[PDB]
DNA sequence: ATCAATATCCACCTGCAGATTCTACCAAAAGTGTATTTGGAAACTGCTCCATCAAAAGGCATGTTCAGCTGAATTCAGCTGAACATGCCTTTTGATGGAGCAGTTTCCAAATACACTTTTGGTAGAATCTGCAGGTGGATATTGAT
DNA sequence: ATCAATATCCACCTGCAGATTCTACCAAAAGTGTATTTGGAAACTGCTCCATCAAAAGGCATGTTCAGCTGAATTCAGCTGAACATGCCTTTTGATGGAGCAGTTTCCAAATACACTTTTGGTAGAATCTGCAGGTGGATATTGAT
């Protein structure tokens, strides 16, 4: 069975190298991790049916992003989203 | 002459027995293009696209308005006051 | 040489892609939304990390434990309105006692 | 198109007043107006930021009605009517 | 061959099982969908028309009319309690309000 | 250049000459129906693959859709639904 | 069996919740809305174990009949 | 002696930085059976099933007291009263 | 406002038992590389639908008065709820036995997905009807003043 | 209780905007016949769950006092509703320009399906840290008397 826990932790030693996480504390990110890729996919898939598209690109994922994020927090999800779009797609 | 308050109350009656606008079309169809146009400029609604919007205001703001009326009963009052808008919009989960 | 590393992610791009396939969403899923969705995740568990890291050093603890994560969502703006409809286990509530209540 | 200047002041007074009596509501302060304009044009606000998002991305410069049933379904709203 | 009979006269509804299959089938809800789901689904979607229409043709005779308006629906909703509890968070465009005062406004 | 578009306009207008031959529906009234079915449809569609997907199962059968119409309706229209619905099933499985 | 839910566990309740004083009658509304929101939560958690065809009922079975009325709650696996 | 009110006060404090269990896990397993057995005879719980519900019910019903005594603090009172508790479900949209 | 005196937190230190962190391996996803389809982007174009634009009117908003009636402010008596002390028992914590399920694997009969070919019910106009909206007139019910 | 004065239902009529029915096509179900999965049945296998039992303890339930809080009763200044005169602007309706959709076709950049070959994160042990629960000592806050 999978688990997010190993990439959180990653992210954990990026913005705190010293610091540690409890268990309890673990279930609690992966169940966050789940309910937002849950919201994404979601609106994802409806925008796609709106527009009898049947495939879903990242244009769809950052239209979903400004619709489900409320303000100053959109505008730095789709930069580093983009970002890591270019990113991959350039090398 | 009328009593104060009983011309009020027949008046419940007519505008909750109808189902017309009762906010006039062009000034709310003059506030939404202002808006729009406030979030991007040359932009154009269908005709029946403005309605949607005018029936959903109309029908939030009427259950807000029962809500606040059942503030002001509870706090032993009839004349409403923005002192208990706020604690209905607090309650709604929206605010 | 994998594609986390060739966007520069830490999430796995290949579980997300997998996800999003096998997960009823759309019959076709393109190349670069599993990568731009990671992204995002990446990008949002940062933050409430970060967050609830400085609140353990507000309460000079080196170990991130629920009450860490609540606070540090009820006290932010955009995270509150985010998570509106989501309780926390082990997370207490935010203190506040109001104006009215108390003495002098 | 065009700077349009004050359409707040086409909600009027006793429009307003009819909303209330609608509502159910018999007595008014004056202080009430304003709450009330404010709280609509905050949900106006964000609906139309909703739907000109929905029309951003269907490649489009006018705003349809569906456009605007889903911009409401995103807040809870469900609205018939305007579907067909 | 086997003359055709349409799958709503096999299951004896009003509702056309095989666009039911065709929306369960591209609607992206599962890869593979049963042969009795759409049945069930087009029974549960007549009953529940049914139950709404009979309510609003009763509301719309009582007001003394033939012809079934946005008015009569908004009256037939709000005024059961299961139905409202399922459309409570909906709106009805040109439906009106349900006529409720509190005693506390009326006069003495 | 005038396309087309299905609708559940006239299976509304079939159910309403079922339960009161005499009384009409405005148009506006049809959109209202053809609304309200699609929301219905949808909500059940989605509660249906959510159970699916629950138990590392990939088919829906008639058995999701009836779960999921109990979770979903309030009392007796659950009960009276899935009735129906297990009426239309039972005598759709026979073929005869 | 639900009178077991003493008083003061319901005043600790009612402080965390940062109220400052309590009327007598409150906890019969109390335990009464209590019984209510646990009666819904219990059913959907049971319709959902009982489609799964099991007898023990999962931490899983919780969270989804939480989520179903607009209630996430973390911590226990989604 | 301390004055009424005072004592209730810094309790506050105590459960609004506490987050520990405020049921006893006991009589809170005791009626959760109770329920699960009218519905259904014979149900088994994982022991972390039951702690779910233990954490939703302390929150559901913390919110509710919190915009109960919002709702006494509108009345210009202090203490709670059912009369508020039902005004709150309301206007919860419940 | 001060001031002595508890009580009550608050700050810092401290040991340790329980989680925590670190290691050693593998089924199953993840990655690479072909053999193919395919949705969707690009380019026109046919054509609704939107946006202005005009103008009188008559319906409604506005501004001002006046009075009645409501919200705000005050007093206060009685009672309800908090505080505190008491003692008893219900809760937790630890430990065992074993039993009833979940969960894992394996192997099919049955159910469903595809690949094509006909048969229609459904849909979009054309051609018909037809309840409903306005507009009067009569008969009540309601409201306010004596 | 009466009585004048408005406001309100109820029915009726008619023209028509819209709902209904009738007809002619055509996209899509229905039917036939393979090819592919999969839920499910059988047999184990551990594994959490349930059921007792003891004991330490601290939370619960009871009872008593007392203070502050809430509901009742009163007053009144001011505010808001009803009215009326004034005038301003929102509604309907028609027509055009054209802009912006929809609809139609065509052709790749991208996605899918497989066949192998790696990489890895998941599972089960071995070996460390660190907030929890206390403890003092100081710093605040409360409560009561001058």
Redesign the pocket.
Known sequence: ??????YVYKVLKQVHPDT?????AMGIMNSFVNDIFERIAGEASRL?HYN????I?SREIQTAVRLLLPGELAKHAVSEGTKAVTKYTSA | ???????????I??FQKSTSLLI????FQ?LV?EVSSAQKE?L??????IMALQEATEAYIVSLMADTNLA?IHA????I?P?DIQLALRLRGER | ????SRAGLQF????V??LL?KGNYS???????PVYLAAVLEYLTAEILELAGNAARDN????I?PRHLQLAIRNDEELNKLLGRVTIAQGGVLPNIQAVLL?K | ??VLRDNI??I????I??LARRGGVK?????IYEETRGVLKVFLENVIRDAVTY?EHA????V?AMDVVYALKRQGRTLYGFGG
């Open positions: 069975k999978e688990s997010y826990s190993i540690g996480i409890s268990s309890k796609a009898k598209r049947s495939t690109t | 002459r009328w009593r104060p308050g009983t011309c009020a109350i027949r008046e009656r007519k006039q079309c062009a000034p003059r293009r040359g154009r609604f269908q005709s029946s696209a002001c032993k009052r009839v004349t006051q002192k | 040489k994998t594609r986390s796995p791009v290949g579980r892609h997998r396939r019959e076709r899923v393109g190349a670069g939304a000079k603890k080196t170990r434990i003495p | 198109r065009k002041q086409g009027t007074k006793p429009a007043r009819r007595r008014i302060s004056g202080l029309t490649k489009r410069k006018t349809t």
